[PDB]
């Protein structure tokens, strides 16, 4: 651990500075260092961890898609053979992406999930586990693709089961989990009807619970509800 000599509090402070400077690779390294101190994370710290790696892997995914599109075109009929370079560079980006996903999954497995006993923390980490297996599934083409997909499904499902038992239907973690599991169904599991059913049921159950909320909680919940509606509009 290159962060092993830095104070936990200093790592958290620098992660926040890195976020302000849009230095997300640095942000992720600082938060990895903080996790490796071994203490459980607060809600704010969990958010810093997730924001950091979301931005890093999000950029990798965008680049992988650009390169995969070029590679696909290169293998159409009538395309000029241009050598191994497009595949090689897509593979380079892919391997870096897989490395980031493995790093995040490693932090969750050693030992964030097993020490997370409150519903809000456990669901949050299990959602992340589903998310990073989902990103691995996006680039998987070989013997383990089915097992990677099932690993995503299993983590999301455990998170869903806890969230339905322990959190209200407007809870933003519960909503965000459902949003992403619905995308998993649509884009990864080839299950668009399940994706639509999940998004619609989540939206309607949340609508019926908004009356219990403060103005600030209402703002949080309806923002994610609009994302559910946005996806439903895309899919129907």
């Amino acid at each position: 651990g290159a962060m092993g000599s830095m104070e936990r509090a200093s790592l958290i402070q620098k992660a926040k500075l890195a976020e302000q400077a849009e230095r997300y690779e640095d942000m992720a390294a600082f938060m990895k260092g903080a996790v490796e101190k071994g203490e459980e994370l607060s809600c704010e710290e969990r958010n810093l961890l997730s924001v950091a790696y979301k931005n890093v892997v999000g950029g990798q995914r965008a680049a992988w898609r650009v390169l995969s599109s070029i590679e696909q075109k290169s293998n159409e009929e009538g395309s000029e053979e241009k050598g191994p370079e497009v595949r090689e560079y897509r593979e380079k980006v892919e391997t870096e992406l897989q490395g980031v996903c493995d790093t995040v999954l490693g932090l969750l497995d050693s030992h964030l999930i097993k020490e997370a006993g409150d519903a809000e923390s456990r669901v949050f980490y299990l959602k992340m586990k589903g998310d990073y297996y989902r990103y691995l599934a996006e680039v998987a083409t070989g013997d383990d693709k089915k097992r990677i997909i099932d690993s995503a499904r299993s983590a999301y499902q455990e998170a869903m089961d806890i969230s339905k038992k322990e959190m209200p239907p407007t809870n933003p973690i519960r909503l965000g989990l459902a949003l992403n599991f619905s995308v998993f169904h649509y884009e990864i599991a080839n299950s668009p009807e399940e994706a639509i059913s999940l998004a619609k049921t989540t939206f309607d159950e949340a609508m019926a619970d908004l009356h219990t909320l403060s103005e600030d909680s209402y703002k949080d919940s309806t923002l994610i509800m609009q994302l559910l509606r946005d996806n439903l509009t895309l899919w129907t």
Binding site: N180, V183, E187, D230, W235
Partner: peptide
Amino acid sequence: FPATV
């Protein structure tokens, strides 16, 4: 590409 958080 659909929305995720």
